Structures are given as C-alpha cells and as structure tokens.
Design a protein around this ligand. Structure first.
Ligand SMILES: [Ca+2]
Length: 559
C-alpha cells in the first residue's frame, strides 16, 4: 500500500459520450479496447480542477454486473494518481443508484461514478456502463458530459497507480501512500445499505411498517429485485429491520449476469413475480430494475398498478408518509407522455403540476428550486426530492405506508381512486427498429397536419363517443430554472374530454405512441383497458397513417 504514480501513453477513442445516463458499451468493447475504460475515467477526473482534488471525495459503486469490480479497481488506481483525496465505495463494489445519490448528498462529495447500465443485460456477453453524477447527487448535466466527451476525444495520456489494489470486501478505511506525494489517498468501504436505510428510516414510519409486515395478520408481500442491486436493500430493510418473512425477498442475491435475464420491471420481464402474485396468496408485489431506480407495483392476484396511476395514488395519500407531513408538498410533476392521472389529484388538492419533457434534469431543476416533492414517469419511474435520482424501493415503502393507513387492498385503493378522480386508461405502444425514413416522414406529415388552422375543433368518432381536438402541437418546454428551451418533444393531440394521443421518436428508430383515455362514468372505469383504449388507438393510427408509413400492423410491445 506504498505505491508509485506512472504516466501511461494512450490513444483516444472517438465515441465516448457520457449521455444522460452514462457511457454504455458491450462488456467486450471495454475488454478488447486498450485503455477504453482508463481513458474515460481520466476524462471524468480531468474535469475536476487540480486545486480542488485533494479535498474532494468521489462516491463509487454499481449494480453488481460483470466487469464492475475490475472497473472500480481502475477508478481507484486512476483517482489516486490524479490527486483525488478520497473514494467512498460500497462493500463488494455494490451501491444502488439511489444509494449513490443519498451518500453524495450526505457526505457532500463532489460527485460519484456509478457502474451500471441500468436495466440492460449484464454478463460476459452483456453491456457495461459508466455513469457520472455531480455534487447535488444527480446525473451530470450536458455541459459537464460535453466537456468529458471533448477531453476523451483528444486524450494522449493518463495518470495511474498500477500497483494500487483496494480490498472491496472489508469495511473501513484503507490508506495508500503515494511515492513522492505528501498526502495519502484514502478509500472508505461502507456497508452498501446503511446510509440509504438510515435515510429511509427518517422518511418513513418504520414502527408502523414493522406492525404492518410482522406477525400472523401481516400484509403478505413478494419483492423481486430481479437478481440486481436492490437485493441486499430488500433483505436488510424489509426483512431484517421491518420483519417481513425471509421469503418476501425474491431474487435478492445480486448476480453478475442478473440470472441471465433482463432486469426490467414490467409484466413480461418480471413474469415470474406476476405468476406468483396470480395465486391470490399475497397482498402486494413489486419489482425493481437492475440499478434500483425503477419499480413496478402489483396487488393481489397480480392486479397491475399502472405507473401513471401509481404516482397519482401516492400524491392522493401523500401525508401517509412522515417526510411529507414535515416538508409539506412543494409541487407535483410528470413527464409529458405520462397519463394525466396525477393532474386530477393536483387540481383537486390545489398543488402545482409541472409537465416536463422526457428526462431527469427537468425534475432535478424543480427540486433544487424547492418546487417539487413528488414526480412520476409512465416508464415505471417514481421519485421525490429526498435525493436526485428516481428510487424504486422508496416507492414501495410509500405504497406500504399508504396500505397501512388505508387498511384496504391495492385493487380497492385504485377502484376508490378511479371513482373519486375519474380513470385515465393508459397504454404505450412501442414500434421498435422501424426504418428511419418512414418514421421521420410519419412525424413530419402528422405535425404539418396538426399545425393547420382547422385542425383544432376537428371531430373523430369512436364507435359511439365523439372526440374533439382541443389543442395539437409539438411539445415545447421553457425551463423556469435554467432558462433553456426544449423543443420538438412530442406530438400532442389533446381532446376536449381530457384524453390525449402522444407520438414520440425515441432518442433503427423507435416510435412511442402513448394513449391516455379519460373516463368518469361508473359503468366504464372498471372495464378492460385495451378495450376502452381501442377507439383512440384507432384514431391515432388513422391520423398518423403509421401502418402506411412504417409497414407495421402491430406494435412491438404494449405496456
Ligand atoms: Ca434504472
């Protein structure tokens, strides 16, 4: 642990873009491309001014996928050589994305490097990702990721301590003396769960939750971490501390290949959990994605809570949670394609509702302005301003808190909610890997059609019901915090009855078609969703001429 600093000549790569969720490549790319990881790590660290490196701490950890520990060792060797004073690293390299955000904010780190590719498959033939978060605990913004990219493109050398090796498996402080450097390099290995659990212990009423989850008359739960990073969090918090029986923790051992499956929480990737819930034995089920910031919520018999409804239900019962009883509710937000269910709650309770373009930064900005308490995305995303990433296990404890106060089943809570606010039937059609020319033509033609002065007021017949266009545009957002203007964020068809159709191209092309059908009638709100959605789906396909432009007669995926 007495080690030399050396300078390594390297050759730059041209494709190392950090994106909004990190640099992601196949594992084999990282393995076969000389200094691929080294170059990128150096580029991140070179964004930190030399004068500020010794007093800086970086938080480092990841989702447990293959190659993670090797990448972490590399980050330590390079951080040390570059004069970064300290790393804080989760035991075994493990930290969920929400735990990283938690720890950065708690210890006032300059940021963190997260070894995750989120839900993407891992293993020797899978994907790997390197994500950079800054001092507010959230994703590095474009100005920073721009700078990292620029540096990586022309880098000709990096600094490294080749003989430095960190023991990731044992808790505590390891110090490294660097040759011809006065100050030591320090690594603190922390328990992967402790800080995050201590945070949750202050947010939620663990006494109430222990009462709910323990004993003969307990709420019966099945919580599926999909062999990813949230596993130990489930075991240590829900089972060990809150007393849920050990069987409650499903697929809660992190695996380097996530068990050979894709850790994304939806009805088909988490098919095993759904089949478990179908037996009527359990009251509540949930699944998480690989790095822990997405969640799916299930009730008895595998009743599916739509993510757009989940955030609305949490909003409508938000003072069941001690944190909000103390902060108050500062605002609500959803991404524009997410259903308008949250809006109904916000309008009725007179709380601001922010409708943002797709992406974290819009939520993070509003939170940093003390204007946003609770946010949701239709893509299984739920969060609050307790940190600056979405948080799947948090959403689960929010649901458990509501179940404890309401003393009703998941399905009955939703039925009561629909009765009170009306129901926003919702689905998302994905058309994957469509020919770009056809997708682009479809969008440009539709947008032109929508811009015509006569389009507003146009009527579309169902069947029975007539839909009337209230507004039609290509969504634009002026950020109230950083002043940026986001344009071309999705074609919106907004109907006078509270329903909407939205088309986006994904950022082969992917078309995402979102259908939001609002119904107030008692005779309609408990019908089957794809049946109730069929009229607007028909209207959407006809006005867009999607089949004509793409050759597709059906979506690839329906959620
Ligand atoms: Ca994720």
């Amino acid at each position: 642990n007495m080690v030399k600093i050396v300078t390594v000549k390297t050759q730059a790569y041209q494709d190392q873009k950090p994106g909004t969720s990190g640099l992601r490549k196949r594992v084999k790319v990282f393995q076969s491309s000389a200094n691929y990881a080294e170059n990128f790590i150096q580029s991140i660290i070179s964004t930190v001014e030399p004068a500020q490196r010794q007093e800086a701490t970086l938080v480092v950890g990841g989702d447990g996928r293959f190659y993670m520990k090797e990448a972490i060792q590399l980050i330590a060797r390079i951080a040390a050589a570059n004069g970064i004073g300290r790393l804080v690293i989760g035991q075994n390299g493990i930290l969920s994305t929400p735990a990283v955000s938690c720890i950065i904010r708690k210890i006032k780190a300059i940021g963190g490097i997260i070894l995750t590719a989120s839900h993407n498959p891992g293993g020797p033939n899978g994907d790997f990702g390197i994500k950079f978060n800054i001092s507010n605990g959230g994703p590095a913004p474009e100005a920073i990721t721009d700078k990292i990219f620029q540096i990586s493109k022309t880098i000709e050398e990096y600094a490294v301590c080749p003989d430095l090796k960190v023991d990731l498996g044992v808790l505590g402080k390891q110090q490294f003396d660097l040759e011809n450097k006065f100050k030591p390099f320090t690594v603190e290995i922390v328990d992967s769960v402790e800080a995050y659990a201590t945070m949750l212990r202050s947010i939620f009423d663990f006494s109430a939750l222990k009462e709910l989850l323990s004993g003969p008359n307990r709420l019966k739960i099945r919580i599926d971490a999909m062999h990813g990073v949230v596993g130990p969090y489930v075991k240590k918090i829900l089972c060990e501390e809150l007393g849920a029986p050990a069987n409650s923790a499903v697929n809660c051992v992190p695996l380097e290949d996530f068990g050979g499956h894709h850790p994304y929480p939806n009805l088909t990737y988490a098919a095993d959990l759904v089949e478990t819930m179908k037996s009527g034995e359990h009251d509540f089920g949930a699944a998480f994605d690989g790095d822990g910031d997405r969640n799916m919520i299930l009730g008895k018999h595998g009743f599916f809570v739509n993510p757009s409804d989940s955030v609305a239900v949490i909003a409508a019962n938000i003072f069941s949670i001690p944190y909000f009883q103390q902060t108050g509710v500062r605002g609500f937000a959803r991404s524009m394609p997410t259903s308008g269910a949250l809006d109904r709650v916000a309008s009725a309770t007179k709380i601001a509702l922010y409708e943002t373009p797709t992406g974290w930064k819009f939520f993070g900005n509003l939170m940093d302005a003390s204007k946003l308490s609770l946010c949701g995305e239709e893509s299984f995303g739920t969060g609050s301003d307790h940190i600056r990433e979405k948080d799947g296990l948090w959403a689960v404890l929010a649901w458990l808190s509501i179940l404890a106060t309401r003393k009703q089943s998941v399905e009955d809570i939703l039925k009561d909610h629909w009765q009170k606010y009306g129901r926003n039937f919702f689905t998302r059609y994905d058309y994957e890997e469509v020919e770009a020319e056809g997708a682009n033509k479809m969008m440009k033609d539709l947008e032109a059609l929508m811009f015509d002065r006569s389009f507003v007021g146009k009527q579309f017949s169902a069947n029975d019901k007539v839909y009337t266009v209230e507004k039609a545009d290509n969504f634009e957002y002026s950020d109230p915090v950083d002043g940026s203007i986001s344009r071309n964020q999705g074609l919106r068809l907004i109907f006078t009855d509270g329903s909407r159709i939205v088309f986006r191209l994904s950022g082969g092309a992917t078309i995402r078609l979102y259908i939001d059908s609002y119904e107030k009638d008692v005779a309609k709100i408990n019908q089957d969703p794809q049946v109730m959605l069929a009229p607007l789906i028909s209207i959407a396909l006809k006005v867009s001429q999607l089949q004509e432009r793409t050759g597709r007669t059906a979506p690839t995926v329906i959620t």
